[PDB]
Amino acid sequence: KFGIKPEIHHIFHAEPKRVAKPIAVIFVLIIFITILSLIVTWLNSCAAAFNNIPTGVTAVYFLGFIATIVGFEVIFARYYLGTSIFETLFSSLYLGAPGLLTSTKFLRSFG
Amino acid sequence: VHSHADGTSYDEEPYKIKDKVIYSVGFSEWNGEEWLPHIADDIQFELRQVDPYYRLTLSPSGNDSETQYYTTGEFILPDRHGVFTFLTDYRKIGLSFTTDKDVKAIRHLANDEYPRSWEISNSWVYISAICGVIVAWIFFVVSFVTTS
Amino acid sequence: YLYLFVFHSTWVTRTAYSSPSVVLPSLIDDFREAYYWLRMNSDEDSKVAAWWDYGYQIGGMADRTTLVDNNTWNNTHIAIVGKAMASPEEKSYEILKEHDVDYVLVIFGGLIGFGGDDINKFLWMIRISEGIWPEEIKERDFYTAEGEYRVDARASETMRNSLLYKMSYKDFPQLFNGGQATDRVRQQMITPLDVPPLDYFDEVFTSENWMVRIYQLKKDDAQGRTLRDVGELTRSSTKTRRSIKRPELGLRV
Amino acid sequence: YEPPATWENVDYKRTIDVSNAYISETIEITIKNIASEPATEYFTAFESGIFSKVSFFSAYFTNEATFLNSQLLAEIRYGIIQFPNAISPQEEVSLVIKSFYNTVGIPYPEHVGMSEEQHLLWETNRLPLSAYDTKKASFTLIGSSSFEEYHPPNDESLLGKANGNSFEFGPWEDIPRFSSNETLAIVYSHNAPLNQVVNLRRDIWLSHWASTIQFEEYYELTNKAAKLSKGFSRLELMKQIQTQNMRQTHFVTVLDMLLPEGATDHYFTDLVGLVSTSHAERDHFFIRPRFPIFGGWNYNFTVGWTNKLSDFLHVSSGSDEKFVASIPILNGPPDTVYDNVELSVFLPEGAEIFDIDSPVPFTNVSIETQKSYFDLNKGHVKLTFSYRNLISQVANGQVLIKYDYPKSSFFKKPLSIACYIFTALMGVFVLKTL
Amino acid sequence: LNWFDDRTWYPLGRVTGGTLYPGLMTTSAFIWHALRNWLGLPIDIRNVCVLFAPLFSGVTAWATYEFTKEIKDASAGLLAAGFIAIVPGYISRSVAGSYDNEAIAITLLMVTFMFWIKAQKTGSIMHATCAALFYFYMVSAWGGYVFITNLIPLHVFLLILMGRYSSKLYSAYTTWYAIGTVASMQIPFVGFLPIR
Amino acid sequence: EHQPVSWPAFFFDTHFLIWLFPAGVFLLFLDLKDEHVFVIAYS
Amino acid sequence: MISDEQLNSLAITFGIVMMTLIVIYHAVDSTMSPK
Amino acid sequence: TYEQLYKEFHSSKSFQPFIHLDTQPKFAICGLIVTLAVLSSALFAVGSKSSYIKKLFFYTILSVIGSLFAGLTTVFASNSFGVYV
Numbered sequence A: 001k002f003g004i005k006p007e008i009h010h011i012f013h014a015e016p017k018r019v020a021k022p023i024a025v026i027f028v029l030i031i032f033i034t035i036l037s038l039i040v041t042w043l044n045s046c047a048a049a050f051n052n053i054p055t056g057v058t059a060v061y062f063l064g065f066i067a068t069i070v071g072f073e074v075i076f077a078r079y080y081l082g083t084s085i086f087e088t089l090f091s092s093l094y095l096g097a098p099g100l101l102t103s104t105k106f107l108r109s110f111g
Numbered sequence B: 001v002h003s004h005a006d007g008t009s010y011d012e013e014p015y016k017i018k019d020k021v022i023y024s025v026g027f028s029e030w031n032g033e034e035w036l037p038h039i040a041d042d043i044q045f046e047l048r049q050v051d052p053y054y055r056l057t058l059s060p061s062g063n064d065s066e067t068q069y070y071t072t073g074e075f076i077l078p079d080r081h082g083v084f085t086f087l088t089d090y091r092k093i094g095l096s097f098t099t100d101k102d103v104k105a106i107r108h109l110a111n112d113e114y115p116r117s118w119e120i121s122n123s124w125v126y127i128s129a130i131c132g133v134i135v136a137w138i139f140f141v142v143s144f145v146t147t148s
Numbered sequence C: 001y002l003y004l005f006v007f008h009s010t011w012v013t014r015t016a017y018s019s020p021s022v023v024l025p026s027l028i029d030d031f032r033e034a035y036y037w038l039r040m041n042s043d044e045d046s047k048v049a050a051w052w053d054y055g056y057q058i059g060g061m062a063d064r065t066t067l068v069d070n071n072t073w074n075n076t077h078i079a080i081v082g083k084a085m086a087s088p089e090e091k092s093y094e095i096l097k098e099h100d101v102d103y104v105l106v107i108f109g110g111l112i113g114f115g116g117d118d119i120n121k122f123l124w125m126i127r128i129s130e131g132i133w134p135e136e137i138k139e140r141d142f143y144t145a146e147g148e149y150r151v152d153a154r155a156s157e158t159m160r161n162s163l164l165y166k167m168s169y170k171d172f173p174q175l176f177n178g179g180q181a182t183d184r185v186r187q188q189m190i191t192p193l194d195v196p197p198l199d200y201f202d203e204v205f206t207s208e209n210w211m212v213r214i215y216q217l218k219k220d221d222a223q224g225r226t227l228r229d230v231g232e233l234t235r236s237s238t239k240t241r242r243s244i245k246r247p248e249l250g251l252r253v
Numbered sequence D: 001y002e003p004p005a006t007w008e009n010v011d012y013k014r015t016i017d018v019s020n021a022y023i024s025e026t027i028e029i030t031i032k033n034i035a036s037e038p039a040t041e042y043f044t045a046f047e048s049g050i051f052s053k054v055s056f057f058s059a060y061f062t063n064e065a066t067f068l069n070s071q072l073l074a075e076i077r078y079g080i081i082q083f084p085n086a087i088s089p090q091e092e093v094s095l096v097i098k099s100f101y102n103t104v105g106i107p108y109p110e111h112v113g114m115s116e117e118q119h120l121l122w123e124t125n126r127l128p129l130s131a132y133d134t135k136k137a138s139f140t141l142i143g144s145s146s147f148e149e150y151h152p153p154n155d156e157s158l159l160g161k162a163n164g165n166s167f168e169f170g171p172w173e174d175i176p177r178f179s180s181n182e183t184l185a186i187v188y189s190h191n192a193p194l195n196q197v198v199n200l201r202r203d204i205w206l207s208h209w210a211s212t213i214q215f216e217e218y219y220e221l222t223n224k225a226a227k228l229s230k231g232f233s234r235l236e237l238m239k240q241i242q243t244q245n246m247r248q249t250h251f252v253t254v255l256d257m258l259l260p261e262g263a264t265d266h267y268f269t270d271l272v273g274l275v276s277t278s279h280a281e282r283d284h285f286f287i288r289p290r291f292p293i294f295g296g297w298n299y300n301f302t303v304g305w306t307n308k309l310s311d312f313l314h315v316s317s318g319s320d321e322k323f324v325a326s327i328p329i330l331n332g333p334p335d336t337v338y339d340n341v342e343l344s345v346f347l348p349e350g351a352e353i354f355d356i357d358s359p360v361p362f363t364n365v366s367i368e369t370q371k372s373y374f375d376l377n378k379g380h381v382k383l384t385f386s387y388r389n390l391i392s393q394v395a396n397g398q399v400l401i402k403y404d405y406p407k408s409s410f411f412k413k414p415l416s417i418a419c420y421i422f423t424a425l426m427g428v429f430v431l432k433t434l
Numbered sequence E: 001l002n003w004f005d006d007r008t009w010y011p012l013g014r015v016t017g018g019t020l021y022p023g024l025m026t027t028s029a030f031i032w033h034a035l036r037n038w039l040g041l042p043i044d045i046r047n048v049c050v051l052f053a054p055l056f057s058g059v060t061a062w063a064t065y066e067f068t069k070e071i072k073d074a075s076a077g078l079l080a081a082g083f084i085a086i087v088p089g090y091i092s093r094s095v096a097g098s099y100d101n102e103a104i105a106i107t108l109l110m111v112t113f114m115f116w117i118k119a120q121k122t123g124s125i126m127h128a129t130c131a132a133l134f135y136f137y138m139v140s141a142w143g144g145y146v147f148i149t150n151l152i153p154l155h156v157f158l159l160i161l162m163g164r165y166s167s168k169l170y171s172a173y174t175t176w177y178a179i180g181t182v183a184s185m186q187i188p189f190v191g192f193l194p195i196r
Numbered sequence F: 001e002h003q004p005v006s007w008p009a010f011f012f013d014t015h016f017l018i019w020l021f022p023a024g025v026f027l028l029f030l031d032l033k034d035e036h037v038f039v040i041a042y043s
Numbered sequence G: 001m002i003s004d005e006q007l008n009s010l011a012i013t014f015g016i017v018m019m020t021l022i023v024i025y026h027a028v029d030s031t032m033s034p035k
Numbered sequence H: 001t002y003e004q005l006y007k008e009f010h011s012s013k014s015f016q017p018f019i020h021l022d023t024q025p026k027f028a029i030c031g032l033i034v035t036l037a038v039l040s041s042a043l044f045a046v047g048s049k050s051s052y053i054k055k056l057f058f059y060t061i062l063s064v065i066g067s068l069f070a071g072l073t074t075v076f077a078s079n080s081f082g083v084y085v
């Protein structure tokens, strides 16, 4: 090869192929209607409704308990959108400390 | 000199597999009194780990008073991580020999650079299930402490 | 019994397990000396080729690039180094140059009796490199005619020309004034006429007790000659004369 | 720029001693004033190359021991000398100048065996380079066994006269000013190891509770002697030391640190761990590196020790809370040369500096804070000087710091830990009662 | 976590993000950061790495105490601790200089087992989630988690065929598995092995 | 380290627990409970 | 720094103290507890 | 002025330490004993069943003392071990 050598290129591998959008949209609609059906079964059909509701200070503890339960899932959803792990840990430690106390107070008071 | 396809150097953000880089080198000839551009069409660039992976032919894209600049077209880096040498050795008999290589590490793809779970279209039915289970669980927990 | 238990579990720890693995208490430390030499006196981007059970130390103490290390996950990249350290130097210089190797360090406990040197785990190199290159290397040639594994004068002409043997016995005979060197691990006499000269490598460091020896690849010849010809020209200078002989060579391309 | 011609050198004899790994120039000049208004100045001329590396410049009268206000300025460059009393318009006064350069001759062969002797090559100016007209001038080299020239000049007058222990030059009866057209080059024998410390950083930790001052130094040492050909070979080395040939070899085998009067808790550490070949006798710390430092080899190490604090601090007279500290600036091997010095003094947690004086002009001074063991707020007060060119045994000075340390901050050190322990206890209480 | 090591296996490099168990080093880094920011003792990382094993050789004594406090009374657990503090079979791999995975890999081995007993003996869910979390920590810290993964099912199975099935085994084991498997899948080195 | 080993290396690093170990296994077999099965299988 | 024989003695004393306090605790608990 | 600072340095008295470094281990052990002989009473008080205000008072009053003693033992011990202040 004193004078010249042949050219060389790299042949890449084909990437794995996605699927068509309509099928995924149909299968998302099916799951959505299933969840709505479950909610409707809970509310009306199965006659499982809000018989007793806490009032006064027990209602404030109830609001705190719901706030904790929903706040943890908001934290997880925000962490699913590219939030740093350390920030999630700090936001969870700043919510568990009041939330644990309020939830234990509610669960002992209401029973 | 070699650098990213858009301008950023290697020291700002290192290379990763299936990137877009570009290489460029300048030659000059001495005719006895002063330097001049060196019009040669036989130059070849080799990107090689241990045996050549890319062997491209340079084309003249730059001109200076005493320097001729050759560059490769934008090319995709190989599909495997490693430690690759970028090399350009002009060696033809009857004329001076010139070599200039450099060793660069080409890393793999980090977890943060894969396509997200919603950009894909095959996995829109696996996120609806999770969101539905989470919503149903929240409503269940709410209705459990509010029922005889 | 509980008290004998304490008096036993203290004695055992004091005697057996509390032994440093980098400094032999016989207090000699020739590993840290050579690793610090590599760390101080060699450029930061140089590659060191050694057997696979020192790589981690070379990466931690010497802070240089290696080729193989302890968590063996590619078993062919280790066979490459095994084939390098068990072939004649003219083939090792070609196997070790396409990988951009600068230095090569060997262990040799023939002066203090270390036992765990590289010349007695040579057979494992031969096995590993023979599994995937049967034609290139054959374990049958390293043993002598009668079937023994000797480094003495009556050693096989394949081991006498290998890389590790020429590299770990370079000046060992001349070390003793009488000229009759006694290996301690193998307990075999060595004469200065045994070890052939090393033409492609040149020694750059060796510890006080000759334990760790670091050699360097020579840069290829400028005129294009094979370094063995340079060696034969420098060792045989005056007497090697021929009047006139038409060279036999292929027609110029 | 040329200074106003005001003085005349009626005698000019210079001697260069090349015996201790750094050029030490000593010029003795008798000077006369031109008849004019009495001026009080003098401009000594250094070449732009040499002036870049000069580490000491003094000038005193022969009759009087006391020095003068010798100072450097800020392409020939100049250094200013100024007299206490104005010189008479027509008067004759002797004077002596001493300079210490930081450049030694490069090894001439550059490749010598580990048993051969090395020769060094140095390039200077033969005719004196002054800013005034010189009448008589003589040049002399001392401190070496054998001298030789290199490309000697054809003219006989510009030729060195050999002597048993010296190499002199014939006096020139008339020399014009700004004459630097002859670059003399001379080779001489020298067997020292030619040490050079590329970077020194030494920390000094004051402490009033334990009343101990402990030093820690990090040397980066390079040998500048002629490299060895054929590469290293332990056989030759271990065969030559068994014969009586370790007289003045040019590679480093043992260093001799000279510590302060009473030192304790010596240690000698390396980047890859502890070196066990050290030996601390009285007022001397012998150090054996891992490998002998031949020409071109680098060795980076650390050495530390401890001293009583009563020898370096002094409480003031007017008040019992104003302290004066006198830290030594250098104490290392006998004859080295430092290319950078970083001197850090770590005053205690609540100190506050009032005055800082140094006997050698430094390049940069700064004040920061750095936290150490049990430093729970603002750590220690670090005061760092940066010097550039320093010699081992002739740049002997003492940095004088003057600070204060009130007892209202002396006892805050136990309280700042009591605060954490009390907070931890009051936290455990709430965590256990809730 | 995305470290690419180009100073080993020179021409090939090494992806140290998915060939490594990042549980020892993360614990050493957390201890160094705590000792350097929350106590005021800046300690060189070499000293922390060296002295990691002796420090963690007392937590395993406490874990053995708390684990033998289940099999028998507390008085019979202190003896076990006294045994495991000084015994050459465990000292051999946790000497002052050893910085291997086993240094941290036996402590967790005990702690997980403790919680499993506490979960299987009582039947609660909160004592099986702790076992799952410490089994994820052991998966991250050592490649010998396969021992637990094949020993806890053996215990449950031996209790099944012996005729001692109750409503406690169901909750304990199903919670432990359903959390521990999906938690151990999060280690890039383990990958999808727990189902393949 | 990938080999089998003789009986001395068991008394070496377990002084006298090695012959209380069968005794402990037997005394767990005497009164089986839920956790004793785990300990025996582990052993 | 502490020597090696001093450390050996310290380790043996710690082990003896531990093995004695454990037996003291066990012999107190065996009697004082309701059996 | 270097001359006047160098003049003031030599004239003044030397440095007399507060507590000599040779008798600090004694204070270290004699404070380590006390700082735990007291801090056990704190845990006994908090554990004991009594009025909350009295518990708080008899916890802090003998916790401050243990705090001071520990914060003054952890300097003597640190100096005695070889890591000054």
Ligand SMILES: *[C@@H]1O[C@H](CO)[C@@H](O[C@@H]2O[C@H](CO)[C@@H](O[C@@H]3O[C@H](CO[C@H]4O[C@H](CO)[C@@H](O)[C@H](O)[C@@H]4O)[C@@H](O)[C@H](O[C@H]4O[C@H](CO)[C@@H](O)[C@H](O)[C@@H]4O[C@H]4O[C@H](CO)[C@@H](O)[C@H](O)[C@@H]4O[C@H]4O[C@H](CO)[C@@H](O)[C@H](O)[C@@H]4O)[C@@H]3O)[C@H](O)[C@H]2NC(C)=O)[C@H](O)[C@H]1NC(C)=O
Binding pocket: A008, A009, A010, A011, B051, B052, B053, C074, C075, C076, C077, C080, E012
């Ligand atoms: C562990 O360590 C070990 C040792 O370090 C590693 O082992 C090394 O791995 C390398 C890569 O896998 C390997 O390199 C390849 O070796 C092949 C061996 O082929 C043998 O037979 C042929 C004849 O068939 C001989 O010519 C050859 O010399 C061997 O004896 C080579 O064939 C490979 O060559 C191809 O790649 C190189 C490098 O890119 C090119 O220069 C060469 O021209 C070939 O290129 C063709 O194929 C590539 C594939 O990507 C294409 O990209 C390229 O464009 C060319 O394509 C043409 O040909 C294909 C096929 O015909 C065709 O489809 C296409 O259209 C074109 O026509 C290459 O040299 C090393 O040999 C191997 N070393 C050892 C000692 O084993 C191991 O990988 C490590 N493990 C891990 C996990 O990393």
Ligand SMILES: *[C@@H]1O[C@H](CO)[C@@H](O[C@@H]2O[C@H](CO)[C@@H](O)[C@H](O)[C@H]2NC(C)=O)[C@H](O)[C@H]1NC(C)=O
Binding pocket: C039, C040, D198, D199, D220, D221, D222, D298, D299, D300
């Ligand atoms: C040891 O000391 C040498 C001497 O200073 C250091 O070498 C310098 O390294 C830097 C960066 O690698 C270079 O820019 C300098 O030019 C080097 N100096 C010389 C004189 O060569 C070295 O970095 C130090 N540390 C180690 C680990 O070797």
Ligand SMILES: *[C@@H]1O[C@H](CO)[C@@H](O)[C@H](O)[C@H]1NC(C)=O
Binding pocket: B063, B064, B065, B066
């Ligand atoms: C290229 O450069 C040379 C030298 O400066 C100049 O003579 C020539 O005109 C240039 N040609 C073009 C197309 O720019």
Ligand SMILES: *[C@@H]1O[C@H](CO)[C@@H](O)[C@H](O)[C@H]1NC(C)=O
Binding pocket: D364, D365, D366
């Ligand atoms: C002097 O030191 C200070 C402190 O870091 C720095 O900011 C400054 O730039 C330095 N100046 C020079 C001239 O080195």
Ligand SMILES: [Mg+2]
Binding pocket: E100, E101
């Ligand atoms: Mg391992």
